[PDB]
Design a binder for this molecule. Structure first.
Ligand code: 7QT
Ligand code: 7QT
Ligand code: 7QT
Ligand code: 7QT
Ligand code: 7QT
Ligand code: 7QT
Lengths: 151, 151, 151, 151, 151, 151
């Protein structure tokens, strides 16, 4: 259970507004383990694949353009219930509903510029991880505080 | 909609306990735009006008004296749903009910020393803004990150 | 009422992961007064007394070993509703249910390594205080900001 | 001597990059007392007065345009040796020479976008104070921690 | 050499202005190990012993009264060159000369309210440690990141 | 001049001690632009190339083993004088000499576990960038605050 992983991506507005370090620190101080990280401008084709479920929504063309309009930080994090807990830490998808203390609650305002993405389930995490990273980009190491984080 | 404004005042206890910077930083990092700001000791007459709706409450004389007992920082902030979101960020009026992560939940304890004020509605914001500021004190400028905060 | 006290202990995992300063800062910034503090490795006998109600639970031997496996910071804090508010600040006993903004929600993952303890009631605070501190270790002084924190 | 005052202005780049709360917090946590504060777009004529000594420098037209290109936060701060210490806290005028730990050393890069101004001497502070504030904007109150800051 | 220790005391002004958490966090994040900690009001006799070398200085009566005027946090910290490094982190004894980034440079103003004490040499550390703590209050444990801090 | 780049690597001790977010935030808040980033366990052969100049030093086998003993965060950052400024922000190579306010001064103790690397010159930056990154990993975009950071 402690080996669960999620995909977290800082979107272009999070990069542009200078929020990368603050976001990583939230995951680090919680006790989760950084498995993978890269910085890139995601191609339109890649983003169409990421967002394939939405390909018919009216806002899809604009979503893909915005997500391609600057670089993103793509990450994988590991730990117990990291998918669900990761989502709690992000806050609600819509920042208007996100509580103070959460990433979106603290740092952004509108649903179209909501700074971050996290996997919504284990099954979507495994799909997003295979889409965004090569197997060799997932680094295997053990946190020095593992036994103080986990029974 | 993105042009809504609220009035936020740091009460004398907020000033005295050295919380001005911390409070401003919360609004800045969220993406709201500072429109106006001044520091003053509000007269008793001014405060009776600010609090006119409470003039019959038992606590009103003591409320006015406390609000006159040191300086306050008066501000106007702008953004989408700034009134309602501003109140969420402050926390509940009574600090005992305010959640961790909010301004009152993090920083104060009792309802009579609750460090900050925010407008409860658009209509009361517009009245409080006209009471506390001259129209020329409201500054018009565009945040450099506006297009990363709003679609 | 403003003289209520609670017992807070930073558990060995809290110490080990470098969270002592962060935790104390949360209580200080809120307006509570530090009454007593010591750093020690609690003996097994002491811990069995602290946790006497659980002496029959399956996890009790392991709980005691963990709580003896490094030092703890034992504190007393004072203020209005410090017991209940202290527990809100800590978050739920189980970190999986603790909200962002709380100590456990921000800093830990698993119920067996949940970094901190706070008294659950006035009556249990008074018992824990007499167990962990001598009366002469409780310091009486008045915070310089007391009249800005309390009516 | 403990009554000395300085003028500090957060320049339009400081406001645009969201540094107002961070800067104020540095002065507050040091133990200085905020005496006055306002937020305005300074007129070109006002700025030419502020910068009268430089009116012949090649960079003066550009300096005045930049200082008028967005709002500034104008402040007065009080305490022992606040002029000299204020300058130390800001860092060197040229951010390339400012040490880490200082405001310019932490937050900016180039001399023409150096985020903040502080009075260079007691006599220039008193001139800048009279230029930017009316005497009634200077608030008299005593910090609750004064006797823990000063012998 | 990695087993060197220093005595650090947060003075009454440091406690009263709510700096305890901040100060501890500086030592923890650096990689030093907390060995002992207690909170007390030091007696005048104890303080006269601590400050015996200064008993003839004109400021001595004032120094002793102030150091007795509220509680102090007494600590022992361990690590390589902790005495010298500890002093660098504190800053110069006189806050006017302390650089931004240091404890005194960031948080206090005058030499008689200079928030913190650190041992000036290994020999004075060992004397201060035996004066303020019993040998049994010094806790022996190994930090989980020790081998990431030391070769 | 404003297009200069440096290579910054957070070493395995920096990762293990949970300093990645904190370090990135220092570069972001200064005004530098993140150009590239990846997370990997560098091979022994790669590290021997990075450290080719030291291959005869007594500490070289241990340095390579330590640098291979966990993952590193490799980055490229851009801005005016980023190589020299980068070095000033890191502090001296030897943490014993690094000032408070710097990354090494704040966060580490010993030369063999000094948490971070930065290029010592433009020429070594260009060599390190070509060794650690492919050209296509270097992302070109323009900061939204560019004209508030640079004249
Ligand atoms: C913000 C989102 F990226 C979500 O992060 C993602 C997943 O769609 P959902 O929100 O249904 O689901 P999750 O948040 O994953 O639980 O689509 C986007 N999105 C959703 N609604 C809207 C909308 O009105 N406008 C725009 N511009 N983007 C929208
Ligand atoms: C503290 C307040 F200034 C509130 O900030 C404001 C509006 O508080 P309300 O409850 O009317 O409504 P809102 O939540 O603002 O919409 O009155 C005051 N106030 C309310 N109860 C008390 C009380 O017991 N003691 C005192 N000293 N002041 C009180
Ligand atoms: C974490 C706890 F110390 C609680 O902090 C304390 C009192 O927990 P209680 O159930 O008495 O109630 P509170 O919510 O505290 O008032 O026992 C422990 N504890 C409870 N369940 C478990 C468990 O599964 N595993 C382990 N290792 N420890 C557990
Ligand atoms: C940056 C400043 F706004 C300083 O804040 C102010 C006082 O800087 P001065 O050198 O006059 O003197 P002090 O540091 O106070 O002793 O002038 C400006 N300034 C100085 N050099 C330059 C320059 O090259 N380019 C530009 N654009 N502006 C410059
Ligand atoms: C602040 C100090 F506690 C120093 O920490 C310690 C020894 O001061 P020294 O500088 O001799 O030695 P250190 O560098 O400190 O180790 O007495 C105090 N002290 C020094 N000067 C003064 C002064 O003017 N006024 C007052 N009120 N107290 C002073
Ligand atoms: C810390 C370093 F990685 C420096 O980054 C790099 C170049 O050390 P240099 O001083 O040649 O140059 P820089 O200051 O780096 O640009 O060697 C390493 N290093 C230097 N001395 C020692 C030492 O005693 N022990 C160990 N374990 N490693 C050492």
């Amino acid at each position: 259970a402690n080996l669960e992983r999620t995909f977290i991506a800082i979107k272009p507005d999070g990069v542009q507004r200078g929020l990368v370090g603050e976001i990583i620190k939230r995951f680090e101080q919680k006790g989760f383990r950084l498995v993978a990280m890269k910085f890139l401008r995601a191609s339109e084709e890649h983003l169409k694949q990421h967002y394939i479920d939405l390909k018919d929504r009216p806002f899809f063309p604009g979503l893909v353009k915005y997500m391609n309009s600057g670089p993103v930080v793509a990450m994988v994090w590991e730990g117990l219930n990291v998918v669900k807990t990761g989502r709690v830490m992000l806050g609600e998808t819509n920042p208007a509903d996100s509580k103070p203390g959460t990433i979106r609650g603290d740092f952004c305002i509108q649903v179209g510029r909501n700074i971050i993405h996290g996997s919504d389930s284990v099954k979507s995490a495994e799909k997003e991880i295979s889409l965004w990273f090569k197997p060799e980009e997932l680094v295997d190491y053990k946190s020095c505080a593992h036994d103080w984080v986990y029974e």
